[PDB]
Amino acid sequence: MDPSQYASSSSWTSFLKSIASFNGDLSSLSAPPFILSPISLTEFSQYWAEHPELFLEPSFINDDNYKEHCLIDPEVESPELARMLAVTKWFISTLKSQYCSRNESLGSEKKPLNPFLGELFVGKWENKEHPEFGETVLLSEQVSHHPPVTAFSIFNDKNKVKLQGYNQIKASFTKSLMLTVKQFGHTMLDIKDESYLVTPPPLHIEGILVASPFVELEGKSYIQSSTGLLCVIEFSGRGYFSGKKNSFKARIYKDSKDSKDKEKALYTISGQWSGSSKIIKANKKEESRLFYDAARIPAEHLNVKPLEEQHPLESRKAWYDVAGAIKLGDFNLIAKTKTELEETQRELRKEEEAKGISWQRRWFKDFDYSVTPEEGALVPEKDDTFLKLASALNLSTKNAPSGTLVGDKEDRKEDLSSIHWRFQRELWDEEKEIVL
Ligand SMILES: CC(C)CCC[C@@H](C)[C@H]1CC[C@H]2[C@@H]3[C@@H](O)C=C4C[C@@H](O)CC[C@]4(C)[C@H]3CC[C@]12C
C-alpha cells in the first residue's frame, strides 16, 4: 500500500495494539511487512566508518604538520587537540549513517532483522581513490541473541587506525507510544598510540502513531582521549535547545575536570548532525566557522563480496530468503522463511543445552571486569585501555547504559555485572574460512 495508507490500515492498528502488551522484547511486536527492513542489525557496525577520509585523518596529523591539518583553526594549540577535533568530526559524521540511512533507503526507520547468534558481516573499504589510505576492514559478529549484542572492529593496518566495540539496547514504550531506547556498550578508537573512548547516546523513535518512524537523539555522548582531552556532545530535537531536529552541541575540554564548567570549553560546536554545524573557538562567537556539513559529503559504502561466495554465517547469505520475501511484501513467505531460519536456531540451542555444549564466539571474547570475575571467564590486562580512559572520564565500568558516570543511579544498581566484549585480532589472523 502507499505510505499515506499505513497509519489507518488494519495492520498498523493491530500493531499499535500489540504494543500495549509489549514484553520488552521488540521482536514480539507484530510489525506489518511494510515496516520491515531486509537489513540485519549486524550490518549497522559499518556505520562507524562510511567516511574513510575522516576515519583516517587523525593518523596523518603529527608534531610537524598539525597546524596544516585543522581547517577550522590553523592556529590550533597542539597536535593532540587537532586530532581530538578530527576525531570529533569523524564521530559526528557517523551519526547520519547510524540513524538516517533507513529513512533514505527505505522511506522511514523500519524494523531491522534480529540477528541470529553467530551471524557475521564482513567487508572492506578499498579506498581505491586514495592509495595512502590503504584497505580498511570491517568485522561484525553477533555475540549474543538473548539479548541481541553485536560486536565489531574496523581497522586500517597501513595507518594503524583501529576501532572496536559492541552494542546492545533496552527499549520500552511510553504511554504516548514513544519508543525509548537506551544504548549499552562503548567503542574504542586507536590512532597509532593515542586512544579514544566513545559512548553512544540514548535515543527515541518518534512517529509511531502516524506510521512514519524516525530516530531522534537525546542525552550525551563522550569522547575521552588518552591525551586527557574530552569532548562532551549533547543532543536535542525539534526545539528545546535548537529550533531544528537532529541538533547537538559539543564542547572540547582540556580534561574531565574542566568539563564541569562549560566556560572552560576550548571549542564549542553546534548545529545538526544530519546537516551543518559551526564551531567557535573559546568565546569568540563572532568568529564561527563551518565544522561539518553532512549534505556535502556522500557516504561511502564498504565492498561486500558477491552472495555466491559468502560463507553460510555471513548475514546477507543467511538472510537471503527472508530479505527477498520482505522486499516482495509476501506475508506468508516472510513468516515461512523467518520461521525456518529462527526455528533451526532454536533447535540448535536446545541441542547444545541437552548435549551440554556452548556456542563459541568467533572473533570476540567477553572479558569479566568485575572485582569478582567468574572463575572461567577472561579478565582484563594491566594497562587495559578501557580502564584508564574510563577512569579519566570517571565513567562506570559496569554494564550500565552507555555514558553512565560513576555514582549515577544506574551505576549504583545492585548486582550489576561488568562484562565487556573485546576483539581478538589474533583470532582473525588465524581465521581459516572467512575472507574479504
Ligand atoms: C522501527 C519500529 C517499527 C520497530 C523498532 C525498531 C528498532 C528496534 C530499531 C529502529 C532504529 C534502530 C537503531 C538504529 O536507529 C541505529 C542504531 C545504531 C547502531 O550503532 C546500533 C543499533 C541501533 C541503536 C539500532 C537499534 C534498533 C533500532 C532502535
PDB file of C-alpha atoms in Angstrom, residues 93-346:
ATOM      1  CA  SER A  93      29.956  12.183  10.502  1.00  0.00           C
ATOM      2  CA  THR A  94      28.922   8.718  11.674  1.00  0.00           C
ATOM      3  CA  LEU A  95      25.574   9.921  13.030  1.00  0.00           C
ATOM      4  CA  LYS A  96      23.747  10.373   9.712  1.00  0.00           C
ATOM      5  CA  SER A  97      24.803   6.831   8.700  1.00  0.00           C
ATOM      6  CA  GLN A  98      23.863   5.325  12.039  1.00  0.00           C
ATOM      7  CA  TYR A  99      20.445   6.937  12.332  1.00  0.00           C
ATOM      8  CA  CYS A 100      19.135   8.221   8.972  1.00  0.00           C
ATOM      9  CA  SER A 101      20.200   5.525   6.496  1.00  0.00           C
ATOM     10  CA  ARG A 102      16.840   3.717   6.507  1.00  0.00           C
ATOM     11  CA  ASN A 103      14.792   6.887   6.102  1.00  0.00           C
ATOM     12  CA  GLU A 104      16.699   7.453   2.886  1.00  0.00           C
ATOM     13  CA  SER A 105      16.810   3.908   1.513  1.00  0.00           C
ATOM     14  CA  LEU A 106      13.508   2.542   2.858  1.00  0.00           C
ATOM     15  CA  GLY A 107      11.356   5.649   3.325  1.00  0.00           C
ATOM     16  CA  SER A 108      11.486   5.715   7.129  1.00  0.00           C
ATOM     17  CA  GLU A 109      13.049   3.914  10.045  1.00  0.00           C
ATOM     18  CA  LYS A 110      11.929   0.277   9.969  1.00  0.00           C
ATOM     19  CA  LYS A 111      12.234  -2.930  11.975  1.00  0.00           C
ATOM     20  CA  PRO A 112      15.651  -4.492  11.297  1.00  0.00           C
ATOM     21  CA  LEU A 113      16.223  -8.237  11.122  1.00  0.00           C
ATOM     22  CA  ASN A 114      17.045  -9.646  14.585  1.00  0.00           C
ATOM     23  CA  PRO A 115      20.478 -11.295  14.057  1.00  0.00           C
ATOM     24  CA  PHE A 116      20.969 -14.973  14.813  1.00  0.00           C
ATOM     25  CA  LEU A 117      23.642 -15.997  17.323  1.00  0.00           C
ATOM     26  CA  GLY A 118      26.897 -16.395  15.428  1.00  0.00           C
ATOM     27  CA  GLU A 119      25.928 -14.177  12.486  1.00  0.00           C
ATOM     28  CA  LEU A 120      28.827 -12.489  10.728  1.00  0.00           C
ATOM     29  CA  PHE A 121      29.098  -9.463   8.433  1.00  0.00           C
ATOM     30  CA  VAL A 122      32.430  -8.634   6.819  1.00  0.00           C
ATOM     31  CA  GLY A 123      33.723  -6.301   4.146  1.00  0.00           C
ATOM     32  CA  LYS A 124      36.262  -3.629   3.350  1.00  0.00           C
ATOM     33  CA  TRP A 125      36.668  -0.080   2.103  1.00  0.00           C
ATOM     34  CA  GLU A 126      39.282  -0.469  -0.621  1.00  0.00           C
ATOM     35  CA  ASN A 127      39.848   3.295  -0.793  1.00  0.00           C
ATOM     36  CA  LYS A 128      40.990   2.968  -4.392  1.00  0.00           C
ATOM     37  CA  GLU A 129      40.993   6.752  -4.883  1.00  0.00           C
ATOM     38  CA  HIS A 130      43.462   7.194  -2.026  1.00  0.00           C
ATOM     39  CA  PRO A 131      46.456   4.799  -2.118  1.00  0.00           C
ATOM     40  CA  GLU A 132      47.842   6.458   1.016  1.00  0.00           C
ATOM     41  CA  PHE A 133      44.713   5.338   2.890  1.00  0.00           C
ATOM     42  CA  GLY A 134      45.097   1.619   2.352  1.00  0.00           C
ATOM     43  CA  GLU A 135      42.463  -1.052   2.933  1.00  0.00           C
ATOM     44  CA  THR A 136      40.046  -0.695   5.843  1.00  0.00           C
ATOM     45  CA  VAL A 137      38.434  -3.862   7.177  1.00  0.00           C
ATOM     46  CA  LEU A 138      35.073  -4.292   8.923  1.00  0.00           C
ATOM     47  CA  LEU A 139      34.403  -7.385  11.046  1.00  0.00           C
ATOM     48  CA  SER A 140      30.990  -7.654  12.704  1.00  0.00           C
ATOM     49  CA  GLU A 141      29.686 -10.562  14.782  1.00  0.00           C
ATOM     50  CA  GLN A 142      26.510 -11.282  16.717  1.00  0.00           C
ATOM     51  CA  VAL A 143      27.990 -12.415  20.027  1.00  0.00           C
ATOM     52  CA  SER A 144      24.552 -12.761  21.656  1.00  0.00           C
ATOM     53  CA  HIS A 145      20.934 -13.345  20.556  1.00  0.00           C
ATOM     54  CA  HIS A 146      19.324 -13.410  24.007  1.00  0.00           C
ATOM     55  CA  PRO A 147      19.701 -10.487  24.313  1.00  0.00           C
ATOM     56  CA  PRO A 148      20.943  -9.137  20.964  1.00  0.00           C
ATOM     57  CA  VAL A 149      24.552  -7.975  21.145  1.00  0.00           C
ATOM     58  CA  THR A 150      26.703  -7.044  18.157  1.00  0.00           C
ATOM     59  CA  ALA A 151      30.490  -6.770  18.474  1.00  0.00           C
ATOM     60  CA  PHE A 152      32.680  -5.180  15.822  1.00  0.00           C
ATOM     61  CA  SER A 153      36.076  -3.966  14.752  1.00  0.00           C
ATOM     62  CA  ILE A 154      37.143  -1.746  11.882  1.00  0.00           C
ATOM     63  CA  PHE A 155      40.847  -1.453  11.260  1.00  0.00           C
ATOM     64  CA  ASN A 156      43.364   0.098   8.890  1.00  0.00           C
ATOM     65  CA  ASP A 157      46.728  -1.660   9.267  1.00  0.00           C
ATOM     66  CA  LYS A 158      48.594   0.710   6.931  1.00  0.00           C
ATOM     67  CA  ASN A 159      47.928   3.811   9.011  1.00  0.00           C
ATOM     68  CA  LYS A 160      47.490   1.996  12.327  1.00  0.00           C
ATOM     69  CA  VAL A 161      43.923   3.150  12.901  1.00  0.00           C
ATOM     70  CA  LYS A 162      41.764   0.590  14.671  1.00  0.00           C
ATOM     71  CA  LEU A 163      38.318   0.658  16.241  1.00  0.00           C
ATOM     72  CA  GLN A 164      36.453  -1.952  18.261  1.00  0.00           C
ATOM     73  CA  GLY A 165      33.294  -2.055  20.327  1.00  0.00           C
ATOM     74  CA  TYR A 166      29.970  -3.717  20.912  1.00  0.00           C
ATOM     75  CA  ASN A 167      26.366  -2.683  21.208  1.00  0.00           C
ATOM     76  CA  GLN A 168      23.073  -3.667  22.786  1.00  0.00           C
ATOM     77  CA  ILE A 169      19.902  -1.860  23.787  1.00  0.00           C
ATOM     78  CA  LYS A 170      16.927  -1.920  26.125  1.00  0.00           C
ATOM     79  CA  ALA A 171      13.688  -0.495  24.779  1.00  0.00           C
ATOM     80  CA  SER A 172      10.290   0.400  26.191  1.00  0.00           C
ATOM     81  CA  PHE A 173       7.283   2.423  25.070  1.00  0.00           C
ATOM     82  CA  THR A 174       5.805   5.457  26.817  1.00  0.00           C
ATOM     83  CA  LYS A 175       2.016   5.831  27.017  1.00  0.00           C
ATOM     84  CA  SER A 176       2.200   8.276  24.129  1.00  0.00           C
ATOM     85  CA  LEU A 177       3.824   5.477  22.085  1.00  0.00           C
ATOM     86  CA  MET A 178       7.306   6.994  22.031  1.00  0.00           C
ATOM     87  CA  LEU A 179       9.902   4.214  21.818  1.00  0.00           C
ATOM     88  CA  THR A 180      12.646   4.986  24.339  1.00  0.00           C
ATOM     89  CA  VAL A 181      15.984   3.374  23.604  1.00  0.00           C
ATOM     90  CA  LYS A 182      18.978   3.145  25.910  1.00  0.00           C
ATOM     91  CA  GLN A 183      22.183   2.004  24.279  1.00  0.00           C
ATOM     92  CA  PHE A 184      24.737  -0.096  26.185  1.00  0.00           C
ATOM     93  CA  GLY A 185      28.366  -0.692  25.298  1.00  0.00           C
ATOM     94  CA  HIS A 186      31.202   1.521  24.140  1.00  0.00           C
ATOM     95  CA  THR A 187      33.672   1.851  21.289  1.00  0.00           C
ATOM     96  CA  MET A 188      37.413   2.428  21.361  1.00  0.00           C
ATOM     97  CA  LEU A 189      39.417   4.103  18.609  1.00  0.00           C
ATOM     98  CA  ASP A 190      43.193   3.932  18.466  1.00  0.00           C
ATOM     99  CA  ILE A 191      45.215   6.323  16.327  1.00  0.00           C
ATOM    100  CA  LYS A 192      48.709   4.841  16.444  1.00  0.00           C
ATOM    101  CA  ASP A 193      49.497   5.140  20.169  1.00  0.00           C
ATOM    102  CA  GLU A 194      46.704   7.595  21.029  1.00  0.00           C
ATOM    103  CA  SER A 195      43.373   6.238  22.290  1.00  0.00           C
ATOM    104  CA  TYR A 196      39.769   7.421  22.314  1.00  0.00           C
ATOM    105  CA  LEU A 197      36.741   6.058  24.171  1.00  0.00           C
ATOM    106  CA  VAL A 198      33.367   6.833  22.599  1.00  0.00           C
ATOM    107  CA  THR A 199      29.979   6.197  24.211  1.00  0.00           C
ATOM    108  CA  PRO A 200      26.829   6.059  22.064  1.00  0.00           C
ATOM    109  CA  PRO A 201      23.847   8.226  23.136  1.00  0.00           C
ATOM    110  CA  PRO A 202      20.326   7.225  24.158  1.00  0.00           C
ATOM    111  CA  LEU A 203      17.566   7.822  21.624  1.00  0.00           C
ATOM    112  CA  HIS A 204      13.861   7.645  20.953  1.00  0.00           C
ATOM    113  CA  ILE A 205      11.797   6.637  17.951  1.00  0.00           C
ATOM    114  CA  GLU A 206       9.165   9.197  17.023  1.00  0.00           C
ATOM    115  CA  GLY A 207       6.267   8.926  14.591  1.00  0.00           C
ATOM    116  CA  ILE A 208       4.953   5.506  15.582  1.00  0.00           C
ATOM    117  CA  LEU A 209       1.304   6.604  15.689  1.00  0.00           C
ATOM    118  CA  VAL A 210       1.449   8.069  12.176  1.00  0.00           C
ATOM    119  CA  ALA A 211       3.362   5.022  10.904  1.00  0.00           C
ATOM    120  CA  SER A 212       6.428   7.007   9.844  1.00  0.00           C
ATOM    121  CA  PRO A 213       9.101   6.110  12.455  1.00  0.00           C
ATOM    122  CA  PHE A 214      12.282   8.131  12.703  1.00  0.00           C
ATOM    123  CA  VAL A 215      15.206   8.490  15.080  1.00  0.00           C
ATOM    124  CA  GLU A 216      15.994  11.469  17.274  1.00  0.00           C
ATOM    125  CA  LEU A 217      18.969  11.532  19.612  1.00  0.00           C
ATOM    126  CA  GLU A 218      18.967  12.739  23.219  1.00  0.00           C
ATOM    127  CA  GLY A 219      21.239  12.702  26.268  1.00  0.00           C
ATOM    128  CA  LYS A 220      25.024  12.790  25.866  1.00  0.00           C
ATOM    129  CA  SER A 221      27.915  11.015  24.158  1.00  0.00           C
ATOM    130  CA  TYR A 222      31.505  11.255  25.362  1.00  0.00           C
ATOM    131  CA  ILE A 223      34.840  11.094  23.553  1.00  0.00           C
ATOM    132  CA  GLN A 224      37.577  10.592  26.146  1.00  0.00           C
ATOM    133  CA  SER A 225      41.146  10.563  24.879  1.00  0.00           C
ATOM    134  CA  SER A 226      44.325   9.184  26.410  1.00  0.00           C
ATOM    135  CA  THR A 227      45.674  12.715  25.932  1.00  0.00           C
ATOM    136  CA  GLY A 228      43.302  13.878  28.639  1.00  0.00           C
ATOM    137  CA  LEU A 229      41.157  15.875  26.225  1.00  0.00           C
ATOM    138  CA  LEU A 230      37.434  15.176  26.410  1.00  0.00           C
ATOM    139  CA  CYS A 231      34.560  16.060  24.106  1.00  0.00           C
ATOM    140  CA  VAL A 232      31.032  16.168  25.523  1.00  0.00           C
ATOM    141  CA  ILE A 233      28.279  16.007  22.895  1.00  0.00           C
ATOM    142  CA  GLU A 234      24.683  16.819  23.898  1.00  0.00           C
ATOM    143  CA  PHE A 235      21.732  16.006  21.610  1.00  0.00           C
ATOM    144  CA  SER A 236      18.329  17.685  21.241  1.00  0.00           C
ATOM    145  CA  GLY A 237      15.362  17.577  18.862  1.00  0.00           C
ATOM    146  CA  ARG A 238      12.659  19.830  17.390  1.00  0.00           C
ATOM    147  CA  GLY A 239      13.132  22.701  19.819  1.00  0.00           C
ATOM    148  CA  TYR A 240      14.307  22.772  23.430  1.00  0.00           C
ATOM    149  CA  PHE A 241      17.917  23.618  22.554  1.00  0.00           C
ATOM    150  CA  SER A 242      17.742  24.264  18.806  1.00  0.00           C
ATOM    151  CA  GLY A 243      14.834  25.129  16.534  1.00  0.00           C
ATOM    152  CA  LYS A 244      15.596  22.118  14.353  1.00  0.00           C
ATOM    153  CA  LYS A 245      15.596  18.333  14.744  1.00  0.00           C
ATOM    154  CA  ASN A 246      18.799  16.271  14.930  1.00  0.00           C
ATOM    155  CA  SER A 247      20.656  19.063  16.749  1.00  0.00           C
ATOM    156  CA  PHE A 248      23.681  18.881  19.007  1.00  0.00           C
ATOM    157  CA  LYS A 249      26.204  20.947  20.875  1.00  0.00           C
ATOM    158  CA  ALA A 250      29.695  19.605  21.530  1.00  0.00           C
ATOM    159  CA  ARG A 251      32.388  21.083  23.749  1.00  0.00           C
ATOM    160  CA  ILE A 252      36.026  20.081  23.979  1.00  0.00           C
ATOM    161  CA  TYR A 253      37.808  20.437  27.316  1.00  0.00           C
ATOM    162  CA  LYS A 254      41.423  20.101  28.447  1.00  0.00           C
ATOM    163  CA  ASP A 255      40.254  17.294  30.726  1.00  0.00           C
ATOM    164  CA  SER A 256      37.357  15.661  32.557  1.00  0.00           C
ATOM    165  CA  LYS A 257      37.670  18.116  35.445  1.00  0.00           C
ATOM    166  CA  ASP A 258      37.258  21.151  33.183  1.00  0.00           C
ATOM    167  CA  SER A 259      34.110  19.690  31.593  1.00  0.00           C
ATOM    168  CA  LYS A 260      32.247  20.560  34.799  1.00  0.00           C
ATOM    169  CA  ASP A 261      32.473  24.229  33.785  1.00  0.00           C
ATOM    170  CA  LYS A 262      31.146  24.961  30.279  1.00  0.00           C
ATOM    171  CA  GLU A 263      33.133  28.213  30.275  1.00  0.00           C
ATOM    172  CA  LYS A 264      36.360  26.202  30.203  1.00  0.00           C
ATOM    173  CA  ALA A 265      35.381  24.813  26.796  1.00  0.00           C
ATOM    174  CA  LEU A 266      38.278  25.130  24.338  1.00  0.00           C
ATOM    175  CA  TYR A 267      35.806  24.973  21.436  1.00  0.00           C
ATOM    176  CA  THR A 268      32.042  24.813  21.136  1.00  0.00           C
ATOM    177  CA  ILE A 269      30.360  23.132  18.145  1.00  0.00           C
ATOM    178  CA  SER A 270      26.649  23.420  17.351  1.00  0.00           C
ATOM    179  CA  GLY A 271      24.145  22.620  14.628  1.00  0.00           C
ATOM    180  CA  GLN A 272      22.573  19.497  13.161  1.00  0.00           C
ATOM    181  CA  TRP A 273      24.473  16.220  12.840  1.00  0.00           C
ATOM    182  CA  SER A 274      22.397  15.281   9.780  1.00  0.00           C
ATOM    183  CA  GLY A 275      23.140  18.693   8.317  1.00  0.00           C
ATOM    184  CA  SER A 276      25.524  21.575   9.011  1.00  0.00           C
ATOM    185  CA  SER A 277      27.286  22.625  12.207  1.00  0.00           C
ATOM    186  CA  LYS A 278      29.576  25.511  13.105  1.00  0.00           C
ATOM    187  CA  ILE A 279      32.441  25.840  15.552  1.00  0.00           C
ATOM    188  CA  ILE A 280      33.539  28.705  17.803  1.00  0.00           C
ATOM    189  CA  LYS A 281      36.941  28.938  19.496  1.00  0.00           C
ATOM    190  CA  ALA A 282      36.953  29.954  23.155  1.00  0.00           C
ATOM    191  CA  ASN A 283      34.189  32.560  23.389  1.00  0.00           C
ATOM    192  CA  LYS A 284      34.935  34.221  20.044  1.00  0.00           C
ATOM    193  CA  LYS A 285      31.325  33.854  18.871  1.00  0.00           C
ATOM    194  CA  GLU A 286      31.921  36.396  16.102  1.00  0.00           C
ATOM    195  CA  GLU A 287      34.412  34.005  14.502  1.00  0.00           C
ATOM    196  CA  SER A 288      32.280  30.905  13.903  1.00  0.00           C
ATOM    197  CA  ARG A 289      33.343  28.619  11.043  1.00  0.00           C
ATOM    198  CA  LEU A 290      31.739  25.665   9.251  1.00  0.00           C
ATOM    199  CA  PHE A 291      32.711  22.498  11.107  1.00  0.00           C
ATOM    200  CA  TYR A 292      30.817  19.828   9.171  1.00  0.00           C
ATOM    201  CA  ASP A 293      28.048  19.611   6.576  1.00  0.00           C
ATOM    202  CA  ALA A 294      26.703  16.084   6.101  1.00  0.00           C
ATOM    203  CA  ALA A 295      24.917  17.093   2.887  1.00  0.00           C
ATOM    204  CA  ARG A 296      28.197  17.903   1.090  1.00  0.00           C
ATOM    205  CA  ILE A 297      29.920  14.602   1.857  1.00  0.00           C
ATOM    206  CA  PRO A 298      28.412  11.473   0.255  1.00  0.00           C
ATOM    207  CA  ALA A 299      28.701   8.324   2.353  1.00  0.00           C
ATOM    208  CA  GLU A 300      30.985   5.595   1.015  1.00  0.00           C
ATOM    209  CA  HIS A 301      29.616   2.078   1.404  1.00  0.00           C
ATOM    210  CA  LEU A 302      32.005  -0.797   2.021  1.00  0.00           C
ATOM    211  CA  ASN A 303      32.654  -3.526  -0.504  1.00  0.00           C
ATOM    212  CA  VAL A 304      30.963  -6.834   0.276  1.00  0.00           C
ATOM    213  CA  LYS A 305      31.773  -9.907  -1.801  1.00  0.00           C
ATOM    214  CA  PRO A 306      29.006 -11.290  -4.027  1.00  0.00           C
ATOM    215  CA  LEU A 307      26.389 -13.553  -2.469  1.00  0.00           C
ATOM    216  CA  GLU A 308      27.738 -16.501  -4.450  1.00  0.00           C
ATOM    217  CA  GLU A 309      30.994 -16.530  -2.471  1.00  0.00           C
ATOM    218  CA  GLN A 310      29.685 -15.768   1.009  1.00  0.00           C
ATOM    219  CA  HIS A 311      30.089 -18.152   3.956  1.00  0.00           C
ATOM    220  CA  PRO A 312      26.787 -19.506   5.372  1.00  0.00           C
ATOM    221  CA  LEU A 313      27.286 -17.425   8.528  1.00  0.00           C
ATOM    222  CA  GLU A 314      27.510 -14.208   6.521  1.00  0.00           C
ATOM    223  CA  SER A 315      24.432 -12.065   7.097  1.00  0.00           C
ATOM    224  CA  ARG A 316      23.248 -11.449   3.554  1.00  0.00           C
ATOM    225  CA  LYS A 317      23.710 -15.087   2.529  1.00  0.00           C
ATOM    226  CA  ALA A 318      21.897 -16.449   5.580  1.00  0.00           C
ATOM    227  CA  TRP A 319      19.012 -13.952   5.402  1.00  0.00           C
ATOM    228  CA  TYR A 320      18.668 -14.147   1.607  1.00  0.00           C
ATOM    229  CA  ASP A 321      15.255 -15.837   1.557  1.00  0.00           C
ATOM    230  CA  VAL A 322      13.823 -13.635   4.302  1.00  0.00           C
ATOM    231  CA  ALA A 323      15.155 -10.456   2.639  1.00  0.00           C
ATOM    232  CA  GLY A 324      13.637 -11.489  -0.675  1.00  0.00           C
ATOM    233  CA  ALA A 325      10.249 -12.181   0.932  1.00  0.00           C
ATOM    234  CA  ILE A 326      10.301  -8.858   2.758  1.00  0.00           C
ATOM    235  CA  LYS A 327      11.119  -6.995  -0.445  1.00  0.00           C
ATOM    236  CA  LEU A 328       8.234  -8.820  -2.113  1.00  0.00           C
ATOM    237  CA  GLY A 329       5.905  -7.997   0.774  1.00  0.00           C
ATOM    238  CA  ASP A 330       4.579 -11.560   0.862  1.00  0.00           C
ATOM    239  CA  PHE A 331       3.045 -12.034   4.326  1.00  0.00           C
ATOM    240  CA  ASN A 332       3.130 -15.854   4.248  1.00  0.00           C
ATOM    241  CA  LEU A 333       6.571 -16.135   2.661  1.00  0.00           C
ATOM    242  CA  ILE A 334       8.051 -13.741   5.233  1.00  0.00           C
ATOM    243  CA  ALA A 335       6.617 -15.779   8.088  1.00  0.00           C
ATOM    244  CA  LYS A 336       7.701 -19.046   6.465  1.00  0.00           C
ATOM    245  CA  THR A 337      11.285 -18.012   5.692  1.00  0.00           C
ATOM    246  CA  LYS A 338      11.821 -16.227   9.025  1.00  0.00           C
ATOM    247  CA  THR A 339      10.472 -19.176  10.999  1.00  0.00           C
ATOM    248  CA  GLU A 340      12.620 -21.638   9.047  1.00  0.00           C
ATOM    249  CA  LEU A 341      15.797 -19.775   9.973  1.00  0.00           C
ATOM    250  CA  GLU A 342      14.783 -18.992  13.551  1.00  0.00           C
ATOM    251  CA  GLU A 343      13.355 -22.448  14.256  1.00  0.00           C
ATOM    252  CA  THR A 344      16.612 -24.000  13.073  1.00  0.00           C
ATOM    253  CA  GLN A 345      18.457 -21.757  15.535  1.00  0.00           C
ATOM    254  CA  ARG A 346      16.094 -22.734  18.372  1.00  0.00           C
TER     255      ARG A 346
END
